[PDB]
Amino acid sequence: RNIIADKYDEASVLFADIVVRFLDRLYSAFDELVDQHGLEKIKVSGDSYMVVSGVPRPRPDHTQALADFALDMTNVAAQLDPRGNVPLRVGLATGPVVAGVVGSRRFFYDVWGDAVNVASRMESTDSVGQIQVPDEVYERLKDDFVLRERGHINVKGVMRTWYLIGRKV
């Protein structure tokens, strides 16, 4: 009741692993590749890379479409590392799969109110480089913080706003 699942008698699957800054560099190029070849990257846990061909969108040439992808992928991994040293393992199969959507559930903290609205509008009308604030936060900071007025903006009425310069040292 939480999974929509569809059988595919034949698709093509690719797993890669290479296998902080370095990882993200490669993977961007792989993502670009996936988009170039018009293929589908599947989210998987723990640093391994997975691309599918023929799913969700069937392709008469699904295996070879993937094979071509794999060949580019090695040519990118090839160079493009740390010192002079990228070790990429890549695996391909073609056969039946099941594909579809998993209905997981998450729990997040969230906040609502006028303060959220006021904060939103303070950001989106802020002057670049500044921290913009209403009267209410000004009142709370004036003693310990130094602030300079901006003036009266229409906030989707009319409010006075201040820039927050810094602490008082």
Question: Per-residue DSSP letters for 33-81?
Answer: HHHHTT-EEPP-SSS-EEEEESSSS--TTHHHHHHHHHHHHHHHHT---
Q: Determine the angle formed by the axes of helices 62-77 and 21-36, rounding to 10 degrees.
A: 150
From CA 166, how far away is CA 145, in angstroms rounded? 6
Amino acid occupying residue 134:
P
Domain containing residue 65: CATH number: 3.30.70.1230
From CA 155, how far away is CA 136, in angstroms rounded? 15
Q: Which of 43, 106, 148, 156 is catalytic?
A: 156
- Return the structure tokens found at 123: 């950001």
From CA 116, how far away is CA 112, in angstroms rounded? 6
Q: Is 121 a catalytic residue?
A: yes
Backbone φ and ψ of 84, nearest 5°? -110, -10
Q: Note the resolution in Å, 1 decimal.
A: 2.7
Query: Judging by DSSP bridges, how do beta strands 40-41 and 49-53 pair with one another?
Result: antiparallel
Annotated binding-site positions: 17, 47
Please tell me whether residue 158 adopts helix, strand or coil conformation.
strand
Q: Is 43 a catalytic residue?
A: no
Total number of residues shown for the chain: 169
Residue range(s) defining the domain that contains residue 13: 1-169
The neighbouring-strand residues paired with 152 are 160
The contacts of residue 145 (CB under 8 Å, 6+ apart) are 164, 165, 166, 167, 168
DSSP 126: P
Annotated binding-site positions for Mg(2+): 17, 47
**Structural contact between residues 42 and 93, judged by C-beta atoms closer than 8 angstroms:** no
Q: How many domains does the chain have?
A: 1
Phi-psi region of 4 (alpha: psi -120 to 50; beta: other; left: phi over 0): beta
Q: Which of 121, 140, 148, 168 is catalytic?
A: 121
